Amino acid sequence: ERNRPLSDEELDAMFPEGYKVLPPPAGYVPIRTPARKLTATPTPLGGMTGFHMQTEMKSVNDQPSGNLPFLKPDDIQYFDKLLVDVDESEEQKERKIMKLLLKIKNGTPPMRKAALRQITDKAREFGAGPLFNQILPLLMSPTLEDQERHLLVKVIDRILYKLDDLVRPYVHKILVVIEPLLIDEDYYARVEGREIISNLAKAAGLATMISTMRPDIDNMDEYVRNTTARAFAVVASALGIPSLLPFLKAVCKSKKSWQARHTGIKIVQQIAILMGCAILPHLRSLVEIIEHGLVDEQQKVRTISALAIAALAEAATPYGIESFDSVLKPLWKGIRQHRGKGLAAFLKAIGYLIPLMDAEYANYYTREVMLILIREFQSPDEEMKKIVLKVVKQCCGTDGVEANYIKTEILPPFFKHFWQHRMALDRRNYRQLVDTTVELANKVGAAEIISRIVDDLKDEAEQYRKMVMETIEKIMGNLGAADIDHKLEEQLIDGILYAFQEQTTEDSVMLNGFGTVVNALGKRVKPYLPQICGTVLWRLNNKSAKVRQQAADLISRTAVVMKTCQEEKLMGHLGVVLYEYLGEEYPEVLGSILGALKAIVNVIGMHKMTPPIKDLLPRLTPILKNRHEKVQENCIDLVGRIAD
Amino acid sequence: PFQACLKVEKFGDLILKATEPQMVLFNLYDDWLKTISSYTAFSRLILILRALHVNNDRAKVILKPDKTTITEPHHIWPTLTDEEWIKVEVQLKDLILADYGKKNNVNVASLTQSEIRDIILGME
Amino acid sequence: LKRQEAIAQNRRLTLEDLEDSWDRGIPRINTLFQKDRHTLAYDKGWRVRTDFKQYQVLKQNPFWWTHQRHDGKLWNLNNYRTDMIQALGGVEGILEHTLFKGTYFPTWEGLF
Amino acid sequence: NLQAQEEEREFYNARRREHRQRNDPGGNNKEKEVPAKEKPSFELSGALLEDTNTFRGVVIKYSEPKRWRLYPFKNAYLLGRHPIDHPSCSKQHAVFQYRLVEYTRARVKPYIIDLGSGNGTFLNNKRIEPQRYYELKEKDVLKEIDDEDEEEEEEVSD
Amino acid sequence: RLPPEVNRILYIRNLPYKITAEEMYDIFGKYGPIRQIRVGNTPETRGTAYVVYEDIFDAKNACDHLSGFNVCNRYLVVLYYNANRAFQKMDTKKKEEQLKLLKEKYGI
Amino acid sequence: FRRTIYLAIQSSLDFEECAHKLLKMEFPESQTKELCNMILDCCAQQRTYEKFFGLLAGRFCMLKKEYMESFEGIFKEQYDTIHRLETNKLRNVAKMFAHLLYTDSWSVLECIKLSEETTTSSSRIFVKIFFQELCEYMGLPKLNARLKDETLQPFFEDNPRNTRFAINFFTSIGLGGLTDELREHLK
Amino acid sequence: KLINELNEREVQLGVADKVSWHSEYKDSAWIFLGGLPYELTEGDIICVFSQYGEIVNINLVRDKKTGKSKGFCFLCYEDQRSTILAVDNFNGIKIKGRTIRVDH
Amino acid sequence: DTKLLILALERLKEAYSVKSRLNQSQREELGLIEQAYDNPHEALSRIKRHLLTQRAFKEVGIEFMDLYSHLVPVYDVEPLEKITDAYLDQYLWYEADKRRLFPPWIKPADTE
Amino acid sequence: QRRKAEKDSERDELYAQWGKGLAQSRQQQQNVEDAMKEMQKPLARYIDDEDLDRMLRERPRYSGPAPPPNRFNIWPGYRWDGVDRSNGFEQKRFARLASKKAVEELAYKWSVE
Amino acid sequence: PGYHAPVADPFAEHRPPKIADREDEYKKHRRTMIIS
Amino acid sequence: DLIFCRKQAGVAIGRLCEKCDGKCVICDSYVRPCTLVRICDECNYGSYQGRCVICGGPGVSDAYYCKECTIQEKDRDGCPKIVNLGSSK
Amino acid sequence: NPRTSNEVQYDQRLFNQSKGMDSGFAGGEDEIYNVYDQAWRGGKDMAQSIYRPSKNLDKDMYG
Ligand SMILES: [Zn+2]
Ligand SMILES: [Zn+2]
Ligand SMILES: [Zn+2]
């Protein structure tokens, strides 16, 4: 590995200019040769160290000139040239003055600003060569920060708004550091990266990019192949699909090795994701490229291929069905014979396809897919479950599918295998599950789905409760509460109160959930009020900072319902009770209180306010000093409503 | 369930051994009133009695879980800490509700809080 | 001794065999197990700096002699509170002097 | 009815297990739980280098009775043929793994352990059988039969 | 049991302008055999040196014990030297002859 | 009665005051068993050994002849719970009887026995401590006297085996300087 | 690889035990070890995974004709908490250079 | 080094731990110490720079704490020199204890 | 076909009883013994005999070294390799849970002020 | 003392609160990339 | 870094979030909402359904143009959905 | 190859319980309070929630 012995040309390869190799003796060199043998031998021998008591020059260097903001102990290696104070005697003075970088990296924000401009206007002067030579090591640094990274990205942008023909030799030398930005956990890092590669490719020439980036296609590591694929995606967004087509179409037919074709196909995909809706014109040519990989002897190429078809169709949302046409008949056939991930991938593709077919052809074809779809619910693969999930959305969310068939065949296994505590803890699986369940409700109706998932409101874990809660929310949002019967409605309101009574974190899902449930139920909720508001007051105490704000907001969103049903005692309650909390010292609570008052003002009118405005308003007036935000917001709002 | 209170070994034994009509006193709260309110001790009491009334010996499993758990002669029920009391209370609620729903063929995760409170506390 | 027996057994010691002495000893043996213990191993002369804090800082420290981080907590008064409440007649009798029945709280078990 | 099934099973060690768990090659003689260097055990003895216990090695070429070097044992050691073995030996009779010398705790005491070298090893011109730790005492001698070299052990004193 | 960033090369600084490679080889020669050592002979780089060993763990024990180690009045700056940066001054070539050799001698 | 005792004892500094407070109250005498049972339990149950609760039990004896008896009884009552009590409170007891017995509130011991036959590993530790405390006062010489005139048998014998258990066990305790004569007897 | 990030969302959010997704099962000992090295065999994987329990019986899938491992094994312990411990613990492990996967 | 600097900074933070609105100079002290946590190596280098150079410091405030018997001098320094001096002290005591400078008979000692 | 269908079916009994957790089943069994205690011991307190001996004491199994602590405290099997192979999530999970306990206390210390 | 010495970073606590490593074992091959 | 996409204006209605709700897009002003916003489904699609024209949150309302930009006829140019000069997501 | 170390040293469950450094307790200010280490009752001590219902555990462990 990295410990493999080296050669003197390889030795001259690493270190920069201006250093000498030394023998001191031939004898000390023979000590260095015996040192290996003596690393074992002399370590097994007499040795020790000691110190004597005796009375006692101390040179050192920070970065002095006037100021020179501080150097981390490692960064010395980069900035050492600045440390020496030799000054005032060509290019060496341009590298020396280029340490303004250091002012960009570390220092006060003003130093970073002024430095940044000063180096922007010196672009044309210094040229890209010295800059990148003195930058790319820093942006390559193993100790690099988050901020420092981002800032060096900024300077690379700002200098690349100017330099155009100049960067041609450095393009690859740039991308090598930049392509790792495309695959990252941070999103803003990704949009930045795509931006600066856009500026680079458009900045340089097409042939510059192409001729540059070929050798990374067959590179042994797949990492560079992947991030390189996303690179071609970005540059293709820059210079357009048709310009870059013949390159690709040449790549996917390369007869050398498969890895290339794998890369190029991945490129087709990432183009599909990036360009998205705008793929539309060249969709045909793209398909005509990719189609030849589905039948290939290698597996990967097949998998990633069909996946790329998926991405296409998903950005192809319905149009261009016949362009996918010739692709189908193999795919369906493959649907029969496959085991493992490739199968699921095909299911992904076909899944996004079906909405694009005709309800007659897609009738047959769909009815065929449903079987395998059923059988495959049970696989432990989470990739599997994602795919087959979204599939069930598209297949069974089709207007040309019959309710009763779903009600019988699907729902029982669906709620059996899919609703479990493996899913909800994950993020994507959470969301997608929510959506699919929402759509199944959109077809089979409301009372079914809800009726089966109500009992889970009372389940122990939060995240699960959160999941079924937001599900009920969206469902009753779309279909309406009219379908719901009586008993299941009792289980509803009790479920929602119960779940709402235990809140580990502060979040809207439970609240918006409750509000939507009630406003959807309309005045069918009336018998349930006293239980509600009893809970609302008792919770309205509890232990302060957590739940006060939340119960308050609950009032705020339940105002209109507590109004139209004409419970006036309740308005007395909320009016003077909330009136009393206006002396609460915790701002985050008080804000929610004022909000609740606001919502109560928009239901019961001016002259009917149980806390007559003469009381209220001057009691509000002193609060305006309150600094912290939410108070000022809601307060000024309410003073606005009443003042208006 | 003041009847099941005589299922306890001490009371039933005392009565069956009694040779004359006589008034005897007991404290069913033991020392609880030190750490808790009266009424809450009353809820704990009802839980204990009812639970003795339904599954009997299994409630005794809850109340006599570990042989290192002891009961003092001055007291009717074993000495426990507040954490321990909350746990055994949950277990007793579990006994009552589980068997009620087992008799009435009801899924007892579906019952309400009002229903549960009624079932435990008395006749609905 | 507990270290030596652990050495000969090769099995490291658990919490329970130390549960006996856990709070006991002038160094307050539990102070070995402080999370930040490293840092404190490199602190020296703390006890004298506390003596000279009276000159650096205006306020008057009664606890100057010790520090809980090196020496642990040398007393536990938790009993004194319980016995105090007992001597006054228990929770209820005390509350009988208060407004508590005014607040209409069901119980005092949740007073916070 | 000779071989019913052609494969069956194993229930046996894997080369990558014992491989990965010991590598300089893979080695044998993983140190026991006791092993500790001698100097720190002279620190728990409260001994500066003057009164400390350091085992120095002494060489005599078996044909001619002194020092090609002198070796400390204080800094276990792998006695082998030379690269893998730390204590390399020019002796052409030593198997690629010949023997090992581990200081153990019973007190900090020196121990010699044969790895089952094909020829063997002689202790005071008297061999020891393989696969057991054999304590060594000062002035004892190492070379199974007549061996291009000799060795002696000395504690540091006087 | 090592951090990946450390490498067989160490950048060493806070050196005198008179310093001798005899002291260099002697001192640094404790931890292992020297692959080689360079020293700046140029106006800016005078006072700096690079040490390279046959093995990394050599350098690890080095920076372990040699951390802030003393020479003359000075405490040397001992850091693990970076990689890449300025390289391409040299090229990738001359692989053909050696690879032809290993393809010839062993025949593989 | 049990609660009043606790409050009177927790209230008073010194050990003198609690007796005065307690006697003063003139609570009924027969209970003069359980009361003292109270003191032995109340501190021993209390977390760590404290000098106060042990002194109190003793004075309460010198004032009335019965109180002494009440104690010796309560020491007997231990046999049943010699195994049963958990291995802290033995640390309070062993000493805690150590301080009644160094100061003469010894032969009541004899009831206690050394056998693998019946001794609780609890009881093993109990007695173990009891000596490692009482020794530390009398200093193993006055203890030589007190034993030599004691005639403690179930402890000190037949049963050469039990003489290995005895003598060995007092090499384990570590004192084992009052085990000599028995060593000779082994021979 | 996805497991370890589910255990991090389970620990980070303060899931607190029994709602744990190992309570998903309660019925099952047998564990799934995929991505195993081909040189491995019964006695080996038994010796490594008897760490967290006592494994009663394991069937490792080895291709019938060639008689070599297909690369994964279904195992069965004597104890479930051994399974919970093993999935939650032994996963993401290096063996012979390749990281094994485990799950219920 | 980080160990020492951390200890000293905590020590300084301990005087203000109750933290009412304090005042301006104190505010400077909290903000500057807080600064020292974020960029420690900066603080250490600045400190060593002071220790190698500056021989002239700023004026110290003085006030008397009143014990009603004997007054106690109280000194006030600018925060920079307080952090510098503090690290100087943790370091000096640390090296001192390592080297066994002070014989045992000097006993405002850490051990007891 | 009786003995054969009882090879497959009685193997459904065998691998069915084996499937779940042989270790788990025995623990369940112990509870069954507990029910027996109830019939004779309706409301046991103290000195009654089971408690007596109870407080009157206070198949290869793996030998070597020690087995790192497992939340559930299970000694490793007979022939276990004797080497810790883990992600360390136990410790860290083990350590973190402990840390929280410190957190609840230093959370409180806050409250009095 | 030697026993307490047998019982013998927070800056690495607060400093690591600034930024992060964030990355897996798969991505760190970045560190092996030489310039052009 | 931030500039219009200026693809052809379709029939799709504009969608603004909480934040941007009141703003007329080009004049940056709240005055005299009059006419209505149109952007292409190329700019508004999918995850962009009911998305903010600006920040990328869910649209709670519809943008109205001012009278100022009306008479100067700027509302008739390419779809004024701002694209960052990276992707749009 | 076992993973061995000299001696044993200590377990883990405890080896990281109490805070670190922290330092005593203010210069010694009056305002602090802080005399008691644990709260009085178990109302807020005993659990985050006094009540949660379910028969999930019930009907699972029931059989
Ligand atoms: Zn557009
Ligand atoms: Zn917006
Ligand atoms: Zn406008």
PDB file of N, CA and C in Angstrom, chain K residues 1 10 16 23 30 33 37 39-41 45 47 53 57 61 65 71 76 81 84-85:
ATOM      1  N   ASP K   1     -25.672  34.928  -8.968  1.00  0.00           N
ATOM      2  CA  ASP K   1     -25.942  33.780  -8.112  1.00  0.00           C
ATOM      3  C   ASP K   1     -27.446  33.504  -8.102  1.00  0.00           C
ATOM      4  N   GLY K  10     -46.382  30.262 -18.996  1.00  0.00           N
ATOM      5  CA  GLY K  10     -47.509  29.383 -19.220  1.00  0.00           C
ATOM      6  C   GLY K  10     -48.771  29.875 -18.542  1.00  0.00           C
ATOM      7  N   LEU K  16     -46.773  31.812  -3.747  1.00  0.00           N
ATOM      8  CA  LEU K  16     -45.842  32.353  -2.768  1.00  0.00           C
ATOM      9  C   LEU K  16     -46.114  31.768  -1.391  1.00  0.00           C
ATOM     10  N   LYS K  23     -45.408  40.254  -1.492  1.00  0.00           N
ATOM     11  CA  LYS K  23     -44.520  40.979  -2.397  1.00  0.00           C
ATOM     12  C   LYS K  23     -44.950  40.828  -3.852  1.00  0.00           C
ATOM     13  N   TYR K  30     -45.369  45.972  -1.990  1.00  0.00           N
ATOM     14  CA  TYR K  30     -46.649  45.471  -1.515  1.00  0.00           C
ATOM     15  C   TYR K  30     -47.831  46.228  -2.091  1.00  0.00           C
ATOM     16  N   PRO K  33     -51.850  45.337  -5.530  1.00  0.00           N
ATOM     17  CA  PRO K  33     -51.979  44.066  -6.244  1.00  0.00           C
ATOM     18  C   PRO K  33     -53.095  44.167  -7.274  1.00  0.00           C
ATOM     19  N   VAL K  37     -49.800  36.278 -11.538  1.00  0.00           N
ATOM     20  CA  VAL K  37     -48.510  35.734 -11.951  1.00  0.00           C
ATOM     21  C   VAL K  37     -48.715  34.453 -12.745  1.00  0.00           C
ATOM     22  N   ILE K  39     -46.161  31.309 -14.468  1.00  0.00           N
ATOM     23  CA  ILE K  39     -44.858  30.700 -14.712  1.00  0.00           C
ATOM     24  C   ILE K  39     -45.065  29.331 -15.345  1.00  0.00           C
ATOM     25  N   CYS K  40     -44.041  28.873 -16.060  1.00  0.00           N
ATOM     26  CA  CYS K  40     -44.123  27.604 -16.767  1.00  0.00           C
ATOM     27  C   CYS K  40     -44.047  26.442 -15.790  1.00  0.00           C
ATOM     28  N   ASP K  41     -44.733  25.351 -16.131  1.00  0.00           N
ATOM     29  CA  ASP K  41     -44.601  24.136 -15.341  1.00  0.00           C
ATOM     30  C   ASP K  41     -43.190  23.571 -15.385  1.00  0.00           C
ATOM     31  N   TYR K  45     -43.225  22.457 -11.016  1.00  0.00           N
ATOM     32  CA  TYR K  45     -43.622  21.071 -11.195  1.00  0.00           C
ATOM     33  C   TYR K  45     -43.328  20.261  -9.942  1.00  0.00           C
ATOM     34  N   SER K  47     -42.486  18.598  -6.762  1.00  0.00           N
ATOM     35  CA  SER K  47     -42.128  19.198  -5.481  1.00  0.00           C
ATOM     36  C   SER K  47     -42.277  20.714  -5.535  1.00  0.00           C
ATOM     37  N   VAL K  53     -42.143  30.832  -5.102  1.00  0.00           N
ATOM     38  CA  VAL K  53     -41.425  31.267  -6.293  1.00  0.00           C
ATOM     39  C   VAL K  53     -40.002  31.641  -5.894  1.00  0.00           C
ATOM     40  N   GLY K  57     -40.382  27.136  -0.074  1.00  0.00           N
ATOM     41  CA  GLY K  57     -41.362  26.586   0.832  1.00  0.00           C
ATOM     42  C   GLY K  57     -42.723  26.457   0.180  1.00  0.00           C
ATOM     43  N   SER K  61     -50.368  31.238  -0.862  1.00  0.00           N
ATOM     44  CA  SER K  61     -51.151  32.252  -1.559  1.00  0.00           C
ATOM     45  C   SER K  61     -50.618  32.389  -2.980  1.00  0.00           C
ATOM     46  N   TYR K  65     -49.177  41.127  -9.205  1.00  0.00           N
ATOM     47  CA  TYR K  65     -48.298  42.188  -9.668  1.00  0.00           C
ATOM     48  C   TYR K  65     -48.802  43.553  -9.220  1.00  0.00           C
ATOM     49  N   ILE K  71     -47.926  48.988 -16.097  1.00  0.00           N
ATOM     50  CA  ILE K  71     -47.832  49.956 -17.180  1.00  0.00           C
ATOM     51  C   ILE K  71     -46.508  49.832 -17.920  1.00  0.00           C
ATOM     52  N   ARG K  76     -44.946  40.608 -18.725  1.00  0.00           N
ATOM     53  CA  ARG K  76     -45.147  39.813 -19.927  1.00  0.00           C
ATOM     54  C   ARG K  76     -43.881  39.112 -20.403  1.00  0.00           C
ATOM     55  N   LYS K  81     -39.796  33.071 -12.153  1.00  0.00           N
ATOM     56  CA  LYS K  81     -39.432  32.215 -11.031  1.00  0.00           C
ATOM     57  C   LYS K  81     -37.918  32.258 -10.904  1.00  0.00           C
ATOM     58  N   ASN K  84     -31.675  30.096  -8.481  1.00  0.00           N
ATOM     59  CA  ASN K  84     -30.286  30.165  -8.071  1.00  0.00           C
ATOM     60  C   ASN K  84     -29.432  29.615  -9.204  1.00  0.00           C
ATOM     61  N   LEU K  85     -28.198  30.099  -9.317  1.00  0.00           N
ATOM     62  CA  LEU K  85     -27.357  29.723 -10.448  1.00  0.00           C
ATOM     63  C   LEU K  85     -26.676  28.376 -10.258  1.00  0.00           C
TER      64      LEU K  85
END
